[PDB]
Amino acid sequence: SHMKNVIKKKGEIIILWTRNDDRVILLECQKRGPSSKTFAYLAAKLDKNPNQVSERFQQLMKLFEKSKCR
């Protein structure tokens, strides 16, 4: 895992997501494991629901793998 990253697209249209939130998602996901109860911790933390957190987690992964240009 490299020190920091600048590879980040938007996984939302009208929902409030910033650089500080997506860091906490990846932090507790690697610390614990990507489960519904980990997404529920990150939900209460980031003012979201477990669904919102799970979606952005899966975006972040695909951005590090492919990213691309649309």
UniProtKB/Swiss-Prot annotation:
It comes from the Eukaryota. It is found in: Cytoplasm; Nucleus; Nucleus, PML body; Mitochondrion. Induction: By TNF which induces strong nuclear localization. Self-associates. Component of the death-inducing signaling complex (DISC) with CASP8, FADD and FAS. Interacts with NCOA2 and NCOA3. Interacts with SRRT. Interacts with TRAF2. Interacts with NPAT. Interacts (via SIM domains) with SUMO1 and SUMO2. Interacts with SP100; may negatively regulate CASP8AP2 export from the nucleus to the cytoplasm. Participates in TNF-alpha-induced blockade of glucocorticoid receptor (GR) transactivation at the nuclear receptor coactivator level, upstream and independently of NF-kappa-B. Suppresses both NCOA2- and NCOA3-induced enhancement of GR transactivation. Involved in TNF-alpha-induced activation of NF-kappa-B via a TRAF2-dependent pathway. Acts as a downstream mediator for CASP8-induced activation of NF-kappa-B. Required for the activation of CASP8 in FAS-mediated apoptosis. Required for histone gene transcription and progression through S phase. This is CASP8-associated protein 2. The lineage of its organism: Eukaryota, Metazoa, Chordata, Craniata, Vertebrata.
